[PDB]
């Protein structure tokens, strides 16, 4: 138990973010933040669309 | 999930007609996407990207 929670590191940047599943995140139903994600070719980026 | 490697061996290609006027160039044009990758990017981004 302790062991696995210390082991727990939060997630600070992107890429260790989006490597992770468990916790859930989108962005707004419009807007260029979408626009961004689809023309980004960046592999953190274009597995994040 | 899949285990193991391929136990037999074939490819999957496009159809042309006998002499055909696109026989050798799209034959040319599949086999060059191949070098620097384009066709290997289509394949492993669909399977898995998305």
Same mark, same amino acid.
């Given at each position: ?9 939060? #997630? ?5 973010? !989006?490597?992770? $599943?468990? #916790? ?5 139903? !419009?807007?260029? $933040? ?9 592999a ?6 | ?10 490819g ?39």
């Amino acid at each position: 138990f302790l062991t696995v929670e210390r082991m727990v590191s939060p #997630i600070e940047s992107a890429e260790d973010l !989006s490597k992770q $599943t468990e #916790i859930a995140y989108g962005t707004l139903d !419009s807007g260029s $933040t979408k626009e961004f994600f689809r023309r980004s070719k960046i592999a953190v980026f274009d597995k994040m669309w | 999930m899949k285990v193991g490697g391929n136990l037999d061996s074939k490819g999957y290609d496009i159809a042309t007609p006998k002499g055909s006027s696109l026989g050798t160039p799209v034959n040319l044009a599949v086999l060059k996407l191949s070098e620097q990758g384009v066709l290997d990017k289509l394949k492993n981004k669909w399977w898995y990207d998305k």
